[PDB]
Design a protein around this ligand. Sequence first.
Ligand SMILES: [Mg+2]
Ligand SMILES: [Mg+2]
Ligand SMILES: [Mg+2]
Ligand SMILES: [Mg+2]
Ligand SMILES: [Mg+2]
Ligand SMILES: [Mg+2]
Ligand SMILES: [Mg+2]
Ligand SMILES: [Mg+2]
Ligand SMILES: [Mg+2]
Ligand SMILES: [Mg+2]
Ligand SMILES: [Mg+2]
Ligand SMILES: [Mg+2]
Ligand SMILES: [Mg+2]
Ligand SMILES: [Mg+2]
Ligand SMILES: [Mg+2]
Ligand SMILES: [Mg+2]
Ligand SMILES: [Mg+2]
Ligand SMILES: [Mg+2]
Ligand SMILES: [Mg+2]
Ligand SMILES: [Mg+2]
Ligand SMILES: [Mg+2]
Ligand SMILES: [Mg+2]
Ligand SMILES: [Mg+2]
Ligand SMILES: [Mg+2]
Ligand SMILES: [Mg+2]
Ligand SMILES: [Mg+2]
Ligand SMILES: [Mg+2]
Ligand SMILES: [Mg+2]
Ligand SMILES: [Mg+2]
Ligand SMILES: [Mg+2]
Ligand SMILES: [Mg+2]
Ligand SMILES: [Mg+2]
Ligand SMILES: [Mg+2]
Ligand SMILES: [Mg+2]
Ligand SMILES: [Mg+2]
Ligand SMILES: [Mg+2]
Ligand SMILES: [Mg+2]
Ligand SMILES: [Mg+2]
Ligand SMILES: [Mg+2]
Ligand SMILES: [Mg+2]
Ligand SMILES: [Mg+2]
Ligand SMILES: [Mg+2]
Ligand SMILES: [Mg+2]
Ligand SMILES: [Mg+2]
Ligand SMILES: [Mg+2]
Ligand SMILES: [Mg+2]
Ligand SMILES: [Mg+2]
Ligand SMILES: [Mg+2]
Ligand SMILES: [Mg+2]
Ligand SMILES: [Mg+2]
Ligand SMILES: [Mg+2]
Ligand SMILES: [Mg+2]
Ligand SMILES: [Mg+2]
Ligand SMILES: [Mg+2]
Ligand SMILES: [Mg+2]
Ligand SMILES: [Mg+2]
Lengths: 46, 193, 162
Amino acid sequence: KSRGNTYQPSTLKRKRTFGFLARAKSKQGSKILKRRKLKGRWFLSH
Amino acid sequence: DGLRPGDVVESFRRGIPQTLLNEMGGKVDPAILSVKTTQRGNCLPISMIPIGTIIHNVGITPVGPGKFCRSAGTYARVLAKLPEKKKAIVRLQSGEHRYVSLEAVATIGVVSNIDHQNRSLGKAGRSRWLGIRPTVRGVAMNKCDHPHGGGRGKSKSNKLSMSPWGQLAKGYKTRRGKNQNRMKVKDRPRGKD
Amino acid sequence: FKQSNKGLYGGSFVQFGNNISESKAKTRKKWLPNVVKKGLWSETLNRKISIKMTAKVLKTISKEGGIDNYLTKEKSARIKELGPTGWKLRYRVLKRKDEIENPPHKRRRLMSFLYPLEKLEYRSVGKDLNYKKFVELFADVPVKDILARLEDHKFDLSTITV
RNA sequence: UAUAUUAAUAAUGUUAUGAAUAAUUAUUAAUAAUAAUAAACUAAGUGAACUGAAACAUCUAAGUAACUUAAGGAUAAGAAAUCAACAGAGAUAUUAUGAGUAUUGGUGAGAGAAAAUAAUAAAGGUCUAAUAAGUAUUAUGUGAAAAAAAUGUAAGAAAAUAGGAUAACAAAUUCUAAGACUAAAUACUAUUAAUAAGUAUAGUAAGUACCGUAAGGGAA
RNA sequence: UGCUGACAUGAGUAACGAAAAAAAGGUAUAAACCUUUUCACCUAAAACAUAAGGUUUAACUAUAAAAGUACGGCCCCUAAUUAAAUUAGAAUAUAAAUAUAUUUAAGAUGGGAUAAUCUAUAUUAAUAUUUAUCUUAAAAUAUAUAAUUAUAUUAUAUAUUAUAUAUUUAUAUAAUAUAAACUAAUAAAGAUCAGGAAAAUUAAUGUAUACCGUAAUGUAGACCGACUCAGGUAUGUAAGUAGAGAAUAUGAAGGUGAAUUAGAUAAUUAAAGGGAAGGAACUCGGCAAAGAUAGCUCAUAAGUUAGUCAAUAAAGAGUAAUAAGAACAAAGUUGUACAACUGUUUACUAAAAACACCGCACUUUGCAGAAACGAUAAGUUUAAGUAUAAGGUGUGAACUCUGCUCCAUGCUUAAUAUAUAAAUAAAAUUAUUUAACGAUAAUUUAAUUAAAUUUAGGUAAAUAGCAGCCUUAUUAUGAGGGUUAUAAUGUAGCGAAAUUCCUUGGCCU
RNA sequence: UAUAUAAUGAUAAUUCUAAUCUUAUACUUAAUUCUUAAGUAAUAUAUAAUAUAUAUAUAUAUUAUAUAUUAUAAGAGA
Ligand SMILES: [Mg+2]
Ligand SMILES: [Mg+2]
Ligand SMILES: [Mg+2]
Ligand SMILES: [Mg+2]
Ligand SMILES: [Mg+2]
Ligand SMILES: [Mg+2]
Ligand SMILES: [Mg+2]
Ligand SMILES: [Mg+2]
Ligand SMILES: [Mg+2]
Ligand SMILES: [Mg+2]
Ligand SMILES: [Mg+2]
Ligand SMILES: [Mg+2]
Ligand SMILES: [Mg+2]
Ligand SMILES: [Mg+2]
Ligand SMILES: [Mg+2]
Ligand SMILES: [Mg+2]
Ligand SMILES: [Mg+2]
Ligand SMILES: [Mg+2]
Ligand SMILES: [Mg+2]
Ligand SMILES: [Mg+2]
Ligand SMILES: [Mg+2]
Ligand SMILES: [Mg+2]
Ligand SMILES: [Mg+2]
Ligand SMILES: [Mg+2]
Ligand SMILES: [Mg+2]
Ligand SMILES: [Mg+2]
Ligand SMILES: [Mg+2]
Ligand SMILES: [Mg+2]
Ligand SMILES: [Mg+2]
Ligand SMILES: [Mg+2]
Ligand SMILES: [Mg+2]
Ligand SMILES: [Mg+2]
Ligand SMILES: [Mg+2]
Ligand SMILES: [Mg+2]
Ligand SMILES: [Mg+2]
Ligand SMILES: [Mg+2]
Ligand SMILES: [Mg+2]
Ligand SMILES: [Mg+2]
Ligand SMILES: [Mg+2]
Ligand SMILES: [Mg+2]
Ligand SMILES: [Mg+2]
Ligand SMILES: [Mg+2]
Ligand SMILES: [Mg+2]
Ligand SMILES: [Mg+2]
Ligand SMILES: [Mg+2]
Ligand SMILES: [Mg+2]
Ligand SMILES: [Mg+2]
Ligand SMILES: [Mg+2]
Ligand SMILES: [Mg+2]
Ligand SMILES: [Mg+2]
Ligand SMILES: [Mg+2]
Ligand SMILES: [Mg+2]
Ligand SMILES: [Mg+2]
Ligand SMILES: [Mg+2]
Ligand SMILES: [Mg+2]
Ligand SMILES: [Mg+2]
């Protein structure tokens, strides 16, 4: 069938997988946040 | 096999009971223990199971549960007793003679549902219900997958029958070398039958 | 090599090197020490210390004549060899040897005697005192007083009993 | 229940017939708390592949990139079991000559020192250790392209009447491993001053708008 | 086909994205906005009420109102699963990172008391997957004259009349009243595919009832698709008439009629209707189109694996239809090839003969196991299973059957047959050095010392293999026969095969 | 004849074990979830004595040294 609609929004999954805690509660996510801070990004995670 | 709602069974793993010991009627002196033992359903150690008895639910150790001969229609036979070595020789449904602890568990009689092997599932849905997903043959696969794969048309690729991970699937003894069975008198028929 | 923190490895770690073939092809390989689990009797602790050591360390125990001696050697080499665990075991052994060597007499009952008096005085003035804070206050007071009661004994923390 | 509680001046509405109150006491002493935690520099563990060799596997790239761990304003090194050669020097750390020389390599692509003489540098020499044993050494598998101290497995000494150093032996020299501290010259970063045959496309916005689910990319 | 920026040509061309609209008035302002009327369209939706999502897009800033009994969340409880958390010096393993097992905490898509005669949650006193609702019962009626069947009813849902009250609250109840669907609560009971986890009562006091969601959109212009995109998107109600039906026709209420309009309707293109005579003469091919003489009740053959499988058989009958006069369901037989069958596949050119399958064989593993995973280990799945179990391999239901061979590659079993690699307690001995002893670098021997290797079997439903040459019955032809090679020489069956080049092979229909 | 009694080794097999390995389950003084040092109430071990029959061994008051207020049970085993 047709393609293009790969993003199916759901706040629960959005926050659980790309939220701030989802990254601050691990080694790798903490590194992502730290790298984004160093680059100076305004928005670290959803 | 013969167990039906209504029958009475018992276990003598702990031993012969005081109820009979003090009563002296069924105690060892008249040796009613033989006929109290060799009756289907009850559980006894091999030490007090006579030779040649058909048994199931055999253990390995004096303190361990019944492990062998536990499926439907399965049984084993007591072939020998060695009190000095605290051991017994039992032949299992595989046809293998094996050492077992003489004070190991065993139940008299064959396991029920003898005809379980004559059943016939009629459709793939029945396997799916039971929890069996489809099996894909190696020859149908690609060479990156199972070694049998590849080849235009149906072809076995001159490859010795083997598993997807390169282990021969016809006659290749998998348990080989130093790590074999320490308690093993005689191997199973292995093509004799 | 965090496997070694749990045992007496004698300051020997893994070695990563190359495996050379006859064509002199190289392939990374690893050398492990010969770690063995063993229970050695300790006299000062009067019990078996069960740990993972190397055969070399075990042979050193055999030479030096005991796990106690091995742990309590003085050289900096040994201090380095004895890892975090060995260090703790050494502390236990030396503490036990010291407490066997010099016993306390070669005060708690008098603290108990003084406890109710202070408790009653605090109650009278409207305050309270429990055992924990009591011992905390009077932990480090060498000199006692006779403000109340009478000292009908001359133990004086010297030559107890006849 | 840190407006959280034994003690207190009196009590409403009641206390299985002078005290103890679910809305509480001007009060007084005792008892649990708060992770904003950068970068770069340094040390250590593991460590590629592209590539070069006009192919490729020894070799190279390279102990580099990357990941992981742990310190300090710096870290690391450091006062000879060192060099040297019969004459002598006298701790580390960078730089120039020595020198692309000795050395080394499918003796290919290629790699490559030390003595010694100068420059920068600080007061640069000191004791903290009962003077160092599964240690030196040996065999074996690895180990900075030349030059070598660590390293898995196992055998294993001596006391200055001794030990280390060289393919080996003799003679002679030189220094004392298995115990330690050490400014300065150095690296990174941030301020201040000076000079720019530097920048207005290396001249302040914005890591924003916007793109991707995300890591991430990224304007005028 | 350099990069960025500006501007051109195509060009005022193609397009303006399923669609019914018309007057009068607001307004001598209007195709596009608002109102009224007429007309249409969706109506088991284009309506109503919601979930998720989202630039609040809404009937808006003066804005979406909760103690709970149909209020959700919040909170208690847990599933799947997650966790720099958790465990005498020592939970286990591991180059680091980290990974295991156990605890604990978290985590719905789930469970959680009472309540319209309206209700009360807190503190102190003890520690039931899924599916179905009888042949037969009793009265009164239609019943026939003993039928027997024809049914509310062989079970529930409430309101009225009477027999009674404590100054009419709870009962004991005898009568009256249902046609077809559906609902939530019983009772009994059918197959095997055997059907979640978790948090315990009376008493005495007690309750001033916190926080958050609430608009509108939600088969969409208000979300995911680069667009106000004919795509994707979860629930319940979904008037009546008619029907077996949620099919099909209409449409009562409701909502709507669209960022394109007005003319004209050439060639030509798309979707659709009709067609004389003929009926596949088209084409690679009946591709496309056309063809239905009940939809209910009867009746329904040969084959067959006995299954109304074939079958929704074909043809046919009954029921008003006799010139016809809604939509929808229903689209004929037969031979062959392949595949037992239902199913799966190349999201976006292949749906099949390919995959799967139930069935059939071989093989490994005795459980401290085979198999897979684990910079590698602990450990995990296998399995809380045990040779009728689990893994691997080929074949692919069933009938009739499955012939010959271990040469080769492997597997497998024994041969007192047989190389060597590493590892040492000694010295029959050369070289170097040294005045010297001595210090450094070897070859033979030991009671010693593997797997492999090659010998001999077994193993083909293991991987695999299954030949040539020449005359006799005075003939094409060759029952017998003669010869070389081999492990053996293609058996039963089938045959110009989806296998046959020659090849439009010869013959029949 | 016309190479092992002995001394040793090789091979095969069986046995034992604190090599190794796998499964399961009250007080007294002294420095109020603690420790230590001396003695205890009861739960358990060896050899000497009670008293039994054959001419190598039973069952018990009480005492001699080391401990609990890792261990047991089972299995494999040089
Ligand atoms: Mg997209
Ligand atoms: Mg996820
Ligand atoms: Mg299963
Ligand atoms: Mg199958
Ligand atoms: Mg298959
Ligand atoms: Mg294929
Ligand atoms: Mg492969
Ligand atoms: Mg194939
Ligand atoms: Mg490094
Ligand atoms: Mg190259
Ligand atoms: Mg190439
Ligand atoms: Mg330093
Ligand atoms: Mg280099
Ligand atoms: Mg020294
Ligand atoms: Mg020295
Ligand atoms: Mg060496
Ligand atoms: Mg290199
Ligand atoms: Mg020194
Ligand atoms: Mg986007
Ligand atoms: Mg044009
Ligand atoms: Mg035109
Ligand atoms: Mg146009
Ligand atoms: Mg107008
Ligand atoms: Mg419809
Ligand atoms: Mg309707
Ligand atoms: Mg709506
Ligand atoms: Mg609520
Ligand atoms: Mg919870
Ligand atoms: Mg929920
Ligand atoms: Mg809403
Ligand atoms: Mg609403
Ligand atoms: Mg698109
Ligand atoms: Mg749309
Ligand atoms: Mg309709
Ligand atoms: Mg209408
Ligand atoms: Mg609407
Ligand atoms: Mg439109
Ligand atoms: Mg037109
Ligand atoms: Mg016509
Ligand atoms: Mg006609
Ligand atoms: Mg034709
Ligand atoms: Mg034609
Ligand atoms: Mg057609
Ligand atoms: Mg007929
Ligand atoms: Mg028939
Ligand atoms: Mg149709
Ligand atoms: Mg098929
Ligand atoms: Mg199909
Ligand atoms: Mg396709
Ligand atoms: Mg199909
Ligand atoms: Mg395995
Ligand atoms: Mg099987
Ligand atoms: Mg097949
Ligand atoms: Mg078949
Ligand atoms: Mg065959
Ligand atoms: Mg050798």
